[PDB]
């Protein structure tokens, strides 16, 4: 019976610790995945605008190389 | 001990917080400067009201409360208003940019910038407690901050405080006073995220409160201030057991044992009576039987749904004022031979009763009549799931076309978070169905 | 203290710009000297959204004024409230684009752009918390159209996490003869669809028709038209500028009005051009739209409605509910609660009550179809094309701008045909 009592409280501590642990890691994976996703959304937007700067260089080139 | 810390998140949370703390000050005889003449133990004590107020050496009674918003203009009004001396400036926390009605910004983009500071300030309150019981969290479902920041904070609180109890007062959205078309998205996202982190949640349907102000108080077009005064009365009823003592007083935690049969089935329906104008209360005394009866009138519920068409899993009555058990028992016996009260077959049918003797207080210039006796019923009914069905349907209409989804994706979220949240909601509605089915 | 930075580009841009500041300064109780001599406290509570405070109680519009043609800015300076605008915030070039989009976007505009950016950056760095930008411009000319859309693209590169909002003036053969304007508009739309978050379609056709048909004005000047623009611009920015039950910023407007990122072209409306029922009826009527589109030819995705003046909120609530019920077929059923109403106590000048309407309607396709017809009547026969190839533009850029606008139209058609079941 004293053995069983020890096992119950130890089970309680373990499940509580597991909950804290799973909560900490799930949040870390979500915040990382989110930061990455947002960064990739902005990086794609900037790349599109970079192509617009590159295309405008081609247009000003094309005008001068008419002569 | 046992201290409770209140956390007010976003506009709805903060404004409801204003109304609640103002009313608590009135109920306990605490002045706007924090002085309480009737409190003879200066700078400390373990009286009932100390669960909610700490004390400074200078005799100031300070709410165990943090107010957080991602934008400064609502909290600025607390800083410059009537009750500005009640709070230490460090209890009132604001960023510069809101969540713009977007869960992703509240939880991630903007929320992540202020979350460590919020937990620092909460930690400062928790360190002043000798036996912290838990947290009361006030927020809207619909706002970007009330949804996204609250769910981030609840997750972090589980990490830092373990299984320490967390209760919510959650504002469920209505068309009449809503602010965003994307409220259904934000509501489902927070509900899914928060579900494992909350022990008990009291939903307040803005439409139920709006209707009650219209019908019972003859207010043509209720404002937030009208709604909040009423909400604060209901909140005061629920917390009264923590803030006062008395022989027939029954602790909120003891109601909770009865109200939560399974961890996910944690959404009590609150019903409150009497809500009556000064004009109509004059020369009309509402008895124990009358206000108890009013608890089974669906028009008096904080959430629109029909309990006559569901099953009960628990019924709690929380009385305040001039009420004795003899009258309660008589009122209950009458109700039990006259109403549609069907319990599930696995739960006993006895109503659980508490009585606090301090009468209801009203705020000056308010709409509610001062009465001698009031009651808040807390029931656990399968009917509350109607509120989920309505919200899930609104979510489905938009989501099938992915309307507005790009605002969330643009802030780092994925489609898979929406579908996962929604599935958890389908499983919740399913859970409420299963608990209502007879045993084999 | 959530700040907006205003940019006015070209003749139209600068003209409607100056009108805007006149009407809102008047509404906020601001003199042409920049002093507060108003009576209500609600006037100054959110003043910082649009005005800088320099000491001595001086309020300076956070406004930048731009043109490739030096003349127009003498008009602003020597108009009413010319004394209010910051002198450093004026940025003028020399030649003028002469209705050539390619000149404004790729050539002359490109040379003047960096000095505008310097003024943007200076205004932006002083902001507690920048919401973003509102550009006033036309799409028919060359500066407002070409240099305006270049500016957007460059601003978006430096402030990609800020809101870009335009008030764009759409061309009608009923107002201007300049034949090349359908090219300039199409090229501009191509940019706006990719690079703005929200665009108010101020359609010259609709403004003409309001002035001619409704107001009975036999020959409409730009001054008659701009009285409409300014009343509208005053209306749509109300919830940005005043405290109410609903406090708004440019991001919350976008989130709530824009269900799909390309479908960000709004039909504004105004009433009166009354009882509460009548105002409500009028604001949903074709005759009151600032864009020549019939709402009854499409479906509303979203609607925002602003009522101004002292009236019964209960009545406004019932009438708004009433008009949705009676007109249920014209609102998509897959976005619940897609009509939102706000009330502001401060009426505009000379009216007891008004109604301003912001619509995201699939009926805006009629505007774009009109432009696309005038465009296609020239491009298949190659008319005036050398004006553009001569600046170094490829011919494929014309084809691309065209079928991106064609895509926009058929996307507005897709969501119109869509059902809940
Ligand atoms: N009962 C009540 N509901 C409120 C109040 N303020 C806002 N709401 C509701 O809350 C929802 C909008 O959320 P808010 O709390 O205003 O938003 P927020 O939490 O500040 O989030 P953002 O402003 O998006 O950053 C709507 O359903 C509003 O009706 C209030 O004082 N009382
Ligand atoms: N409603 C309105 N439309 C205007 C006004 N001024 C010009 N427009 C319209 O604007 C278009 C021409 O663009 P402008 O602004 O004059 O040209 P710009 O941007 O200055 O470009 P360039 O002069 O070619 O460098 C035409 O379609 C006109 O009908 C105005 O004050 N009100
Ligand atoms: C379709 O649902 C909605 C549309 C818009 C808004 N917001 C935030 C507004 C922003 C604004 O600047 O002007 C307004 C004027 C009137 C009504 C709303 C807005 C909110 C909503 O639910
Ligand atoms: Ca004490
Ligand atoms: Mg807010
Ligand atoms: Mg010009």
Coordinates of N, CA, C and O in Angstrom, one line a residue, chain B residues 193-317:
Chain B
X193 N -7.6 26.8 -29.5 CA -6.3 27.0 -28.8 C -6.4 27.0 -27.3 O -5.5 26.4 -26.6
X194 N -7.5 27.5 -26.8 CA -7.6 27.7 -25.3 C -8.2 26.5 -24.6 O -8.0 26.4 -23.4
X195 N -8.9 25.6 -25.3 CA -9.7 24.6 -24.7 C -9.1 23.7 -23.7 O -9.6 23.5 -22.6
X196 N -7.8 23.3 -24.0 CA -7.0 22.4 -23.0 C -6.4 23.2 -21.9 O -5.9 22.7 -20.9
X197 N -6.4 24.6 -22.0 CA -5.8 25.4 -21.0 C -6.7 26.1 -20.0 O -6.3 26.7 -19.0
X198 N -8.0 25.8 -20.2 CA -9.0 26.5 -19.3 C -9.8 25.5 -18.6 O -10.2 24.5 -19.1
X199 N -10.1 25.8 -17.3 CA -10.8 24.8 -16.4 C -12.3 25.0 -16.5 O -13.1 24.1 -16.2
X200 N -12.7 26.3 -16.8 CA -14.1 26.6 -16.8 C -14.3 27.9 -17.5 O -13.5 28.9 -17.3
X201 N -15.3 28.1 -18.3 CA -15.4 29.3 -19.1 C -16.9 29.8 -19.1 O -17.7 29.0 -19.5
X202 N -17.1 31.0 -18.7 CA -18.5 31.6 -18.7 C -18.6 32.5 -19.9 O -18.1 33.5 -20.0
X203 N -19.4 32.0 -20.9 CA -19.6 32.7 -22.1 C -20.7 33.7 -21.9 O -21.7 33.4 -21.1
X204 N -20.6 34.9 -22.4 CA -21.6 35.9 -22.4 C -21.9 36.4 -23.8 O -21.0 36.9 -24.5
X205 N -23.1 36.1 -24.3 CA -23.5 36.3 -25.6 C -24.0 37.8 -25.6 O -24.9 38.1 -24.9
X206 N -23.3 38.6 -26.4 CA -23.6 40.0 -26.5 C -25.1 40.3 -26.9 O -25.7 41.3 -26.5
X207 N -25.7 39.4 -27.7 CA -27.0 39.5 -28.2 C -28.0 39.3 -27.0 O -29.1 40.0 -26.9
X208 N -27.8 38.3 -26.2 CA -28.6 38.0 -25.0 C -28.6 39.2 -24.1 O -29.6 39.7 -23.7
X209 N -27.4 39.8 -23.9 CA -27.3 41.0 -23.0 C -28.0 42.2 -23.6 O -28.6 43.1 -22.9
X210 N -27.8 42.4 -24.9 CA -28.4 43.5 -25.7 C -29.9 43.4 -25.6 O -30.5 44.4 -25.3
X211 N -30.5 42.2 -25.9 CA -31.9 41.9 -25.7 C -32.5 42.3 -24.3 O -33.6 42.8 -24.2
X212 N -31.7 41.9 -23.3 CA -32.1 42.1 -21.9 C -32.1 43.6 -21.6 O -33.1 44.1 -20.9
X213 N -31.1 44.3 -22.0 CA -31.1 45.8 -21.8 C -32.3 46.4 -22.5 O -33.0 47.3 -21.9
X214 N -32.6 45.9 -23.7 CA -33.8 46.5 -24.5 C -35.1 46.2 -23.8 O -35.9 47.1 -23.6
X215 N -35.3 44.9 -23.5 CA -36.6 44.4 -23.0 C -36.9 44.7 -21.6 O -38.0 45.2 -21.2
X216 N -35.9 44.5 -20.7 CA -36.1 44.6 -19.3 C -35.7 46.0 -18.7 O -36.2 46.4 -17.7
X217 N -34.8 46.8 -19.4 CA -34.4 48.1 -18.8 C -34.9 49.2 -19.7 O -34.6 50.4 -19.4
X218 N -35.6 48.9 -20.8 CA -36.2 49.9 -21.7 C -35.1 50.8 -22.3 O -35.3 52.1 -22.4
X219 N -34.0 50.3 -22.6 CA -32.9 51.0 -23.3 C -33.0 50.8 -24.8 O -32.9 49.6 -25.3
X220 N -33.3 51.8 -25.6 CA -33.6 51.7 -27.0 C -32.4 51.1 -27.8 O -32.7 50.2 -28.7
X221 N -31.2 51.6 -27.6 CA -30.1 51.2 -28.3 C -28.9 51.1 -27.4 O -28.1 52.0 -27.2
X222 N -28.7 49.9 -26.7 CA -27.7 49.7 -25.6 C -26.3 49.9 -26.1 O -26.0 49.5 -27.3
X223 N -25.5 50.6 -25.3 CA -24.1 50.8 -25.6 C -23.3 49.8 -24.8 O -23.9 49.1 -23.9
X224 N -22.0 49.7 -25.0 CA -21.1 48.9 -24.3 C -21.2 49.1 -22.8 O -21.2 48.2 -22.0
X225 N -21.4 50.4 -22.4 CA -21.6 50.8 -21.0 C -22.8 50.2 -20.4 O -22.7 49.6 -19.3
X226 N -24.0 50.2 -21.1 CA -25.2 49.5 -20.7 C -24.9 48.0 -20.5 O -25.2 47.4 -19.5
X227 N -24.2 47.4 -21.5 CA -24.0 45.9 -21.5 C -23.1 45.5 -20.3 O -23.4 44.5 -19.6
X228 N -22.0 46.3 -20.1 CA -21.0 46.1 -19.1 C -21.5 46.2 -17.7 O -21.1 45.4 -16.9
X229 N -22.4 47.2 -17.5 CA -23.0 47.3 -16.1 C -23.7 46.0 -15.8 O -23.6 45.5 -14.7
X230 N -24.5 45.5 -16.7 CA -25.2 44.2 -16.5 C -24.2 43.0 -16.3 O -24.4 42.2 -15.4
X231 N -23.3 42.9 -17.2 CA -22.3 41.9 -17.2 C -21.5 41.9 -15.9 O -21.3 40.8 -15.3
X232 N -21.2 43.1 -15.4 CA -20.5 43.1 -14.1 C -21.3 42.6 -12.9 O -20.7 42.0 -12.0
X233 N -22.6 42.8 -12.9 CA -23.5 42.2 -11.9 C -23.5 40.7 -12.0 O -23.5 40.0 -10.9
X234 N -23.4 40.1 -13.2 CA -23.4 38.7 -13.3 C -22.0 38.2 -12.8 O -21.9 37.3 -12.0
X235 N -21.0 38.9 -13.3 CA -19.6 38.5 -12.8 C -19.5 38.7 -11.3 O -19.0 37.8 -10.6
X236 N -20.1 39.8 -10.7 CA -20.0 40.0 -9.3 C -20.7 38.8 -8.5 O -20.2 38.3 -7.6
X237 N -21.9 38.4 -9.0 CA -22.6 37.2 -8.5 C -21.7 35.9 -8.4 O -21.8 35.2 -7.4
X238 N -21.0 35.7 -9.5 CA -20.1 34.5 -9.6 C -19.0 34.6 -8.6 O -18.6 33.6 -7.9
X239 N -18.3 35.8 -8.5 CA -17.2 35.9 -7.6 C -17.5 36.2 -6.2 O -16.6 36.2 -5.3
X240 N -18.8 36.6 -5.9 CA -19.2 36.9 -4.5 C -18.8 35.9 -3.4 O -18.4 36.3 -2.3
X241 N -18.9 34.7 -3.8 CA -18.5 33.6 -2.9 C -17.0 33.6 -2.6 O -16.6 33.1 -1.5
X242 N -16.2 34.2 -3.4 CA -14.7 34.4 -3.1 C -14.4 35.6 -2.3 O -13.4 35.7 -1.6
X243 N -15.3 36.6 -2.4 CA -15.0 38.0 -1.9 C -15.6 38.3 -0.6 O -15.1 39.2 0.1
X244 N -16.7 37.6 -0.2 CA -17.3 37.6 1.1 C -17.3 36.3 1.8 O -17.2 35.2 1.2
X245 N -17.5 36.3 3.1 CA -17.7 35.1 3.8 C -19.1 35.1 4.5 O -19.7 36.1 4.8
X246 N -19.5 33.9 4.9 CA -20.8 33.7 5.5 C -21.1 32.2 5.7 O -20.5 31.4 4.9
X247 N -22.0 31.9 6.6 CA -22.2 30.5 7.0 C -22.7 29.7 5.8 O -22.3 28.5 5.6
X248 N -23.6 30.3 5.0 CA -24.3 29.6 3.9 C -23.6 29.8 2.5 O -24.0 29.3 1.5
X249 N -22.5 30.7 2.5 CA -21.6 30.8 1.4 C -21.0 29.5 1.0 O -20.6 28.7 1.8
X250 N -21.0 29.3 -0.3 CA -20.4 28.0 -0.9 C -19.4 28.5 -1.9 O -19.7 29.4 -2.8
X251 N -18.2 28.0 -1.8 CA -17.1 28.4 -2.7 C -17.3 28.1 -4.2 O -17.8 27.0 -4.5
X252 N -17.0 29.1 -5.0 CA -17.0 28.8 -6.5 C -16.4 27.5 -6.9 O -17.0 26.7 -7.7
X253 N -15.2 27.1 -6.3 CA -14.5 25.9 -6.6 C -15.4 24.6 -6.4 O -15.3 23.6 -7.0
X254 N -16.3 24.7 -5.4 CA -17.2 23.6 -5.1 C -18.4 23.5 -6.1 O -18.7 22.4 -6.4
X255 N -18.9 24.7 -6.5 CA -19.8 24.6 -7.7 C -19.1 24.0 -8.9 O -19.7 23.2 -9.6
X256 N -17.8 24.3 -9.1 CA -17.1 23.8 -10.3 C -17.0 22.3 -10.3 O -16.9 21.7 -11.4
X257 N -16.9 21.6 -9.2 CA -16.9 20.2 -9.1 C -18.1 19.6 -9.7 O -18.0 18.6 -10.4
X258 N -19.3 20.2 -9.4 CA -20.5 19.8 -10.0 C -20.7 20.2 -11.5 O -21.3 19.5 -12.2
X259 N -20.1 21.3 -11.9 CA -20.3 21.9 -13.2 C -19.5 21.3 -14.3 O -19.9 21.4 -15.5
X260 N -18.4 20.6 -14.0 CA -17.5 20.1 -15.0 C -17.4 18.6 -14.9 O -16.6 18.1 -14.1
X261 N -18.2 17.8 -15.6 CA -18.2 16.4 -15.6 C -17.1 15.7 -16.4 O -16.7 14.6 -16.1
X262 N -16.6 16.4 -17.4 CA -15.5 16.0 -18.3 C -14.7 17.2 -18.6 O -15.3 18.3 -18.8
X263 N -13.3 17.2 -18.7 CA -12.6 18.4 -18.9 C -13.1 19.3 -20.0 O -13.1 20.6 -19.8
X264 N -13.5 18.8 -21.2 CA -14.0 19.7 -22.3 C -15.4 20.3 -22.1 O -15.7 21.3 -22.7
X265 N -16.2 19.6 -21.2 CA -17.5 20.0 -21.0 C -17.4 21.0 -19.8 O -17.8 20.8 -18.7
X266 N -16.9 22.2 -20.1 CA -16.6 23.2 -19.1 C -17.3 24.6 -19.3 O -16.7 25.6 -18.8
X267 N -18.4 24.6 -20.0 CA -19.0 25.9 -20.3 C -20.4 26.1 -19.7 O -21.4 25.7 -20.2
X268 N -20.4 26.6 -18.4 CA -21.7 26.8 -17.8 C -22.6 27.9 -18.4 O -22.0 28.9 -18.9
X269 N -23.9 27.7 -18.4 CA -24.9 28.7 -18.8 C -25.2 29.5 -17.6 O -25.7 28.9 -16.6
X270 N -25.0 30.8 -17.6 CA -25.4 31.7 -16.6 C -26.8 32.3 -16.9 O -27.1 32.7 -18.0
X271 N -27.6 32.4 -15.8 CA -28.9 33.1 -15.9 C -29.0 34.0 -14.7 O -28.7 33.6 -13.6
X272 N -29.5 35.2 -14.9 CA -29.5 36.1 -13.8 C -30.9 36.8 -13.6 O -31.5 37.2 -14.6
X273 N -31.3 37.0 -12.3 CA -32.5 37.8 -12.0 C -32.4 38.4 -10.6 O -31.7 37.9 -9.8
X274 N -33.1 39.6 -10.4 CA -34.0 40.2 -11.4 C -33.3 41.4 -12.1 O -32.4 42.1 -11.5
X275 N -33.6 41.6 -13.4 CA -33.1 42.8 -14.1 C -34.4 43.6 -14.3 O -35.2 43.3 -15.1
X276 N -34.4 44.7 -13.7 CA -35.7 45.5 -13.6 C -35.3 47.0 -13.4 O -34.3 47.3 -12.8
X277 N -36.1 47.9 -14.1 CA -35.9 49.3 -14.0 C -36.3 49.8 -12.6 O -37.1 49.1 -11.9
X278 N -35.8 51.0 -12.2 CA -36.3 51.6 -11.0 C -37.8 51.8 -11.0 O -38.5 51.5 -10.0
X279 N -38.3 52.3 -12.1 CA -39.7 52.6 -12.4 C -40.6 51.4 -12.0 O -41.7 51.5 -11.4
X280 N -40.2 50.2 -12.5 CA -41.0 49.0 -12.3 C -40.7 48.3 -10.9 O -41.6 47.6 -10.4
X281 N -39.6 48.5 -10.3 CA -39.3 47.9 -9.0 C -40.0 48.7 -7.8 O -40.1 48.1 -6.7
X282 N -40.4 49.9 -8.1 CA -41.1 50.7 -7.1 C -42.4 50.1 -6.7 O -43.1 49.6 -7.5
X283 N -42.5 49.9 -5.4 CA -43.7 49.3 -4.8 C -44.0 47.8 -5.3 O -45.0 47.3 -5.0
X284 N -43.0 47.2 -6.0 CA -43.1 45.8 -6.5 C -41.8 45.0 -5.9 O -40.8 45.1 -6.5
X285 N -42.1 44.2 -4.9 CA -41.0 43.4 -4.2 C -41.0 42.0 -4.9 O -42.0 41.3 -4.9
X286 N -39.8 41.6 -5.4 CA -39.6 40.3 -6.0 C -39.1 39.3 -5.0 O -38.0 39.4 -4.5
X287 N -39.9 38.3 -4.8 CA -39.6 37.3 -3.7 C -38.6 36.3 -4.2 O -38.2 36.3 -5.3
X288 N -38.2 35.4 -3.3 CA -37.3 34.3 -3.6 C -37.9 33.4 -4.7 O -37.2 33.0 -5.7
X289 N -39.1 33.0 -4.6 CA -39.8 32.2 -5.6 C -39.8 32.9 -7.0 O -39.6 32.2 -8.0
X290 N -40.0 34.2 -7.0 CA -40.2 35.0 -8.2 C -38.8 35.0 -9.0 O -38.8 34.7 -10.2
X291 N -37.7 35.4 -8.3 CA -36.4 35.4 -8.9 C -35.9 34.0 -9.3 O -35.2 33.9 -10.3
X292 N -36.2 33.0 -8.5 CA -35.8 31.7 -8.8 C -36.5 31.2 -10.1 O -35.8 30.6 -11.0
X293 N -37.8 31.4 -10.2 CA -38.6 31.2 -11.4 C -38.0 31.9 -12.6 O -38.0 31.3 -13.7
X294 N -37.6 33.1 -12.4 CA -37.1 33.9 -13.5 C -35.8 33.2 -14.1 O -35.4 33.4 -15.3
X295 N -35.1 32.3 -13.3 CA -33.9 31.6 -13.8 C -34.2 30.6 -14.8 O -33.3 30.2 -15.6
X296 N -35.4 30.1 -14.9 CA -35.8 29.1 -15.9 C -36.5 29.8 -17.1 O -37.0 29.1 -18.0
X297 N -36.5 31.1 -17.2 CA -37.0 31.9 -18.3 C -35.8 32.1 -19.3 O -34.9 32.8 -18.9
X298 N -35.8 31.5 -20.5 CA -34.7 31.6 -21.4 C -34.3 33.0 -21.7 O -33.2 33.3 -22.0
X299 N -35.3 34.0 -21.7 CA -35.0 35.4 -21.9 C -34.0 36.0 -20.9 O -33.4 37.0 -21.2
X300 N -33.9 35.4 -19.7 CA -32.9 35.9 -18.8 C -31.5 35.3 -18.9 O -30.6 35.7 -18.1
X301 N -31.3 34.4 -19.8 CA -30.0 33.7 -19.9 C -28.9 34.6 -20.5 O -29.2 35.5 -21.3
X302 N -27.6 34.4 -20.2 CA -26.5 35.1 -20.8 C -26.1 34.6 -22.1 O -25.2 35.3 -22.8
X303 N -26.6 33.5 -22.5 CA -26.3 32.9 -23.8 C -27.6 32.5 -24.4 O -28.4 31.8 -23.7
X304 N -27.9 32.8 -25.7 CA -29.1 32.4 -26.3 C -29.1 31.0 -26.7 O -28.1 30.6 -27.5
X305 N -30.0 30.2 -26.2 CA -30.1 28.8 -26.5 C -31.3 28.3 -25.8 O -31.9 29.0 -25.0
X306 N -31.8 27.1 -26.0 CA -33.0 26.6 -25.3 C -32.8 25.3 -24.5 O -32.9 24.2 -25.0
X307 N -32.6 25.4 -23.2 CA -32.4 24.3 -22.2 C -33.6 23.4 -22.1 O -33.4 22.2 -21.8
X308 N -34.8 23.9 -22.4 CA -36.0 23.1 -22.5 C -35.8 22.0 -23.6 O -36.3 20.9 -23.4
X309 N -35.0 22.3 -24.6 CA -34.7 21.3 -25.6 C -33.4 20.6 -25.4 O -32.9 19.9 -26.4
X310 N -32.7 20.7 -24.3 CA -31.5 19.9 -24.0 C -31.6 19.2 -22.7 O -32.7 19.1 -22.1
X311 N -30.5 18.7 -22.2 CA -30.5 18.0 -20.9 C -29.5 18.7 -19.9 O -28.5 19.2 -20.3
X312 N -29.9 18.7 -18.7 CA -29.1 19.3 -17.6 C -28.1 18.2 -17.1 O -28.4 17.0 -17.0
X313 N -26.9 18.7 -16.7 CA -25.9 17.9 -16.1 C -25.6 18.4 -14.8 O -24.9 17.8 -14.0
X314 N -26.1 19.6 -14.5 CA -25.9 20.3 -13.2 C -26.7 21.6 -13.1 O -26.9 22.2 -14.1
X315 N -27.2 21.9 -11.9 CA -27.9 23.1 -11.6 C -27.4 23.7 -10.3 O -27.6 23.1 -9.3
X316 N -26.9 25.0 -10.4 CA -26.4 25.7 -9.2 C -27.1 27.0 -9.1 O -27.3 27.7 -10.1
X317 N -27.5 27.3 -7.9 CA -28.1 28.6 -7.6 C -27.3 29.4 -6.6 O -27.1 28.9 -5.5

